[PDB]
From Swiss-Prot, chain A:
Specific subunit of the TRAPP II complex, a highly conserved vesicle tethering complex that functions in the late Golgi as a guanine nucleotide exchange factor (GEF) for the Golgi YPT1 GTPase. TRS130 plays a role in the YPT GEF activity of TRAPP II in concert with the two other TRAPP II-specific subunits TRS65 and TRS120. Required for both the cytoplasm-to-vacuole targeting (Cvt) pathway and starvation-induced autophagy through its role in ATG8 and ATG9 trafficking. Part of the multisubunit TRAPP (transport protein particle) II complex composed of BET3, BET5, TRS20, TRS23, TRS31, TRS33, TRS65, TRS120 and TRS130. Interacts with YPT31 and YPT32. The chain holds residues 302 to 401 of 1102 of the full protein. It comes from Saccharomyces cerevisiae (strain ATCC 204508 / S288c) (Baker's yeast). Present with 432 molecules/cell in log phase SD medium. It is found in: Golgi apparatus. Belongs to the TMEM1 family. This is Trafficking protein particle complex II-specific subunit 130. It comes from the Eukaryota.
UniProtKB/Swiss-Prot annotation, chain B:
Required, together with the TRAPP II subunit TRS33, for TRAPP II complex assembly or stability, and for proper Golgi localization of TRAPP and the Rab GTPase YPT31. Signal peptide: none annotated. It comes from Saccharomyces cerevisiae (strain ATCC 204508 / S288c). SUPFAM superfamilies: SNARE-like. This is TRAPP-associated protein TCA17. Keywords: Golgi apparatus. GO terms for biological process: early endosome to Golgi transport; endoplasmic reticulum to Golgi vesicle-mediated transport; intra-Golgi vesicle-mediated transport; protein-containing complex assembly; retrograde transport, endosome to Golgi. InterPro entries: Longin-like_dom_sf, Sedlin. Belongs to the TRAPP small subunits family. Sedlin subfamily. Transmembrane segments: none annotated. Interacts with the TRAPP II complex; TRAPP II subunits TRS33 and TRS65 are required for this interaction.
UniProtKB/Swiss-Prot annotation, chain C:
The gene is BET5. Belongs to the TRAPP small subunits family. BET5 subfamily. The lineage of its organism: Eukaryota, Fungi, Dikarya, Ascomycota, Saccharomycotina. It comes from Saccharomyces cerevisiae (strain ATCC 204508 / S288c) (Baker's yeast). This is Trafficking protein particle complex subunit BET5. It holds the Pfam family Sybindin. Transmembrane segments: none annotated.
Swiss-Prot record, chain D:
It comes from the Eukaryota. Gene3D superfamilies: Trafficking protein particle complex subunit 3. The gene is BET3. This is Trafficking protein particle complex subunit BET3. The keyword Nucleus does not apply. Part of the multisubunit TRAPP (transport protein particle) I complex composed of BET3, BET5, TRS20, TRS23, TRS31 and TRS33. Part of the multisubunit TRAPP (transport protein particle) II complex composed of BET3, BET5, TRS20, TRS23, TRS31, TRS33, TRS65, TRS85, TRS120 and TRS130. Part of the multisubunit TRAPP (transport protein particle) III complex composed of BET3, BET5, TRS20, TRS23, TRS31, TRS33 and TRS85. Keywords: Autophagy, Endoplasmic reticulum, ER-Golgi transport, Golgi apparatus, Lipoprotein, Palmitate, Transport. The lineage of its organism: Eukaryota, Fungi, Dikarya, Ascomycota, Saccharomycotina. Its main location: Golgi. One of its GO terms (biological process) is cytoplasm to vacuole targeting by the Cvt pathway.
Length: 91, 150, 151, 184, 195
């Protein structure tokens, strides 16, 4: 299912740049956070949902660090050369 | 068609060389991201019940990952404990299966290059210094420097 | 049918290795004694045709043509005697021996500087009881390549 | 005359061409390597250029017989003229002339017209004495001829630079002993 | 165009073989040869090349003398290439490390005959050229007990075209270095690597 999400991410990433459709790809991934919103239980099979939520948090951090040269956080610049509004300030 | 780094780890979980192409003549300090991506894959050997290996005949191209701008995987041959990995930049990625078997076969070419330089007795006790430069000098033409061949 | 190739220098030595190109009779050393008695048949008959000479030139030996086989020689002017023992199906190999002198010999022996002239073992037993010299990776292989058409 | 025309036939048989001036610089370079390596001892480079010549001529002579299927000469008088034309002319595109042909037929000299070891060569005043330039030619001739069972000695006596006179090599025949004791 | 002067490749080629036991005899300095004047001891060319790598002496000082001799060849043939012929590509002063591809398209055909190269350069920083059948030592032989013992031996022969192509860059004026590997092609090998 994560590979299916990766192929869906490549389908959105065929054309996604500079929040013209990079914002569309991040919005499709933020609604594709139903991996976190389908199964979430204790005494499950050992934090695979936590790994998936870590990868989705990396996707959301890439969304905030992309879409308008603003802040980064990791000094990453993972966004190379190419609207949930969760971070309204740099601090 | 171009890897974003080349990483080499033996069976003692000691990285042999985390080689990055073009760190001189071009952008620096993303090598500091590259080796910690390699260490993320190093302690991400097997975690959260995800199994890469089911065929024991030949070790083929195992499970793809994607993390913060790159696309990494692993190719554990299980022969002499070699644990070598290759990432690719996601920004130029077509995601096909001849791409997938193409990076499988060029993973076997870099396997061939390591096993050729592993037993070159023209210089003996090449195990600490300029073995690394020599293998880098055999790395840096198989994926790049094709610009003048024609 | 070709039985045996041998190489004979000036210092009465053979430099032919393990017998093949049908010198083992199975591809259609113990003959170190046979090197001497082949040399005695040729060198004595070298002196016969030397003593009958017409017209301000010496005489090369083409072939002693014995019973139930032949022997073809090519003595050089450098004292190298390329000898080849046929089976009387083809005539004299007086240009096959030139091909294996001008091409397979001199471009693969005496141009290679890791192997000598095979003269002597820095010593004065060149005339007998010396271990041979010609052992090359390429030359022995490309000789066997050339002569497996024949046998 | 067949042995007149053998050199031109081999010059159409073999196809090997270097330009002659490229050969001269690779000879002037190696004698400059001897000149700067050793301590300007022009005496003491003739010997080792001769050692070069000996150990390359005794591998040269059998490919010469490979291209030229010639019988082994036994006098001086025919090997002098075939060395004066064919054995140079298939290698060095020259025809040196035998002159001063002595009455006792044991010695001669050899004028050569031009040489491709000494085409455009100037030597300094330090080098202007006590040196013969083509002592490799002495080497290749003597180490060539002791393969074919005659221990002739040749020695090159006059450069076209040293004295600016003429180019001669004094030659002397010696014994014609062949190999022996096949019994052992 | 013009094709006037000609001398053989063969005697040339054995001279190009014979600079190395020359240099070993230089470093190591009876067949009484020139008995009008002097005498020689001997000169074992089969054992001189079996003294560098088959005895492991201090050849490292001697390797510079193989490096030195090609430089004066490599300096002074670029002018001789326009007296070789005049094909109007012969000019020298247009390019820096980008007619070394094409000066070694001609003088590497004029001292080695062939032009099979497959050149590769990383970002036009370092340029390297390789060939599959090197014209001296792919006429050379072995002692047939192995092959890997013989590749110990041939290592001084590779250093003669160090000085040639380093000569042409110092003819253009340079202090950029150079190192030689030995390749292995798979079809019917030595590589070159300059900065």
């Amino acid at each position: 299912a994560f590979q299916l999400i990766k192929n869906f991410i490549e389908s959105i990433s065929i054309e996604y740049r500079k929040s013209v459709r990079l914002l569309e790809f991040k919005h499709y991934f933020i609604t594709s956070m139903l991996s976190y919103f389908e199964f979430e239980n204790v005494s499950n099979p050992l934090l695979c949902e936590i790994k998936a939520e870590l990868l989705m948090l990396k996707r959301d951090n890439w969304v905030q660090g992309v879409m308008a040269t603003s802040g980064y956080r990791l000094m990453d610049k993972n966004y190379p050369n190419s609207k949930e509004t969760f971070v309204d300030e740099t601090v | 068609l171009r890897p974003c780094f080349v990483s080499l780890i033996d069976e003692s979980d000691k990285p042999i060389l985390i080689y990055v192409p073009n760190e001189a003549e071009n952008e620096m300090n993303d090598v500091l991201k590259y080796n910690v991506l390699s260490n993320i894959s190093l302690d991400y050997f097997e975690s959260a019940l995800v199994e890469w290996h089911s065929l024991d005949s030949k070790p083929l191209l195992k499970s793809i990952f994607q993390l913060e701008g790159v696309s990494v995987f692993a190719m554990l041959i299980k022969q002499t404990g070699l644990k070598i990995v290759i990432g690719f930049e996601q920004k130029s990625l077509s995601g096909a299966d001849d791409e997938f078997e193409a990076i499988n076969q060029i993973f076997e070419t870099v396997r061939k290059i390591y096993i050729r330089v592993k037993c070159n007795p023209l210089l003996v006790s090449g195990d600490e210094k300029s073995i690394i430069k020599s293998l880098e000098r055999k790395f840096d033409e198989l994926f790049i420097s094709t610009e003048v061949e024609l | 049918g070709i039985y045996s190739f041998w190489i004979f220098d000036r210092h009465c030595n053979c430099i032919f290795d393990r017998e093949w190109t049908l010198a083992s009779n199975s591809a259609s050393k113990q003959n170190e004694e046979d090197a001497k008695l082949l040399y005695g048949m040729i060198f004595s008959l070298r002196s016969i045709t030397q003593k009958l000479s017409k017209g301000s030139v010496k005489n090369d030996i083409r072939s002693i043509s014995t019973g139930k086989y032949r022997v073809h020689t090519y003595c050089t002017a450098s004292g190298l005697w390329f000898v080849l023992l046929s089976d009387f199906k083809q005539q004299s190999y007086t240009q096959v021996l030139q091909y294996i002198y001008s091409h397979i010999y001199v471009k693969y022996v005496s141009n290679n500087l890791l192997s000598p002239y095979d003269f002597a073992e820095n010593e004065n037993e060149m005339r007998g009881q010396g271990t041979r010299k010609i052992t090359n990776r390429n030359f022995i292989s490309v000789l066997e390549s050339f002569l497996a058409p024949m046998v | 005359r067949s042995l007149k025309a053998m050199g031109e036939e081999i010059w159409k048989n073999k196809t090997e061409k270097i330009n002659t001036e490229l050969f001269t610089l690779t000879y002037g370079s190696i004698v400059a390597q001897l000149c700067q390596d050793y301590e300007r001892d022009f005496n003491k480079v003739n010997d080792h250029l001769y050692s070069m010549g000996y150990n390359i001529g005794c591998r040269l002579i059998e490919d010469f017989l490979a291209r030229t299927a010639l019988p082994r000469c036994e006098n001086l008088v025919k090997t002098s003229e075939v060395l004066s034309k064919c054995a140079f002319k298939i290698f060095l595109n020259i025809t040196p002339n035998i002159t001063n042909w002595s009455h006792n037929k044991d010695t001669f000299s050899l004028i050569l017209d031009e040489n491709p070891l000494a085409d455009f060569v100037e030597l300094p005043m330090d080098a202007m004495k006590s040196l013969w330039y083509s002592n490799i030619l002495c080497g290749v001739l003597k180490g060539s001829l002791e393969m074919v069972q005659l221990d002739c000695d040749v020695w090159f006596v006059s450069d076209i630079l040293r004295g600016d006179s003429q180019t001669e090599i004094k030659v002397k025949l010696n014994r014609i002993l062949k190999d022996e004791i096949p019994i052992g | 165009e013009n094709s006037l002067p000609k001398v053989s490749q063969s005697v040339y080629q054995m001279l190009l073989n014979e600079m190395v036991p020359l240099a070993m005899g230089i470093e190591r300095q009876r067949l009484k040869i020139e008995e009008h004047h002097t005498v020689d001891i001997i000169r074992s060319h089969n054992l001189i090349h079996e003294l560098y790598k088959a005895d492991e002496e201090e050849k490292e000082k001697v390797l510079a003398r193989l490096r030195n001799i090609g430089f004066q060849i490599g300096l002074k043939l670029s002018e001789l290439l326009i007296f070789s012929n005049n094909p109007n590509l012969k000019f020298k002063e247009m390019d820096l490390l980008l007619i070394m591809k094409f000066i070694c398209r001609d003088v590497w055909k004029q001292i080695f005959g062939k032009q099979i190269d497959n050149l590769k350069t990383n970002h036009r920083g370092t340029f390297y050229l390789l060939d599959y059948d090197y014209r001296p030592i792919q006429s050379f032989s072995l002692e047939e007990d192995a092959k890997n013992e013989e590749l110990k031996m041939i290592e001084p022969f590779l250093e003669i075209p160090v000085g040639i192509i380093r000569g042409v860059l110092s003819s253009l004026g340079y202090s950029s270095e150079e190192v030689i590997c030995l390749a292995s092609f798979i079809d019917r090998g030595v590589s070159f690597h300059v900065q």
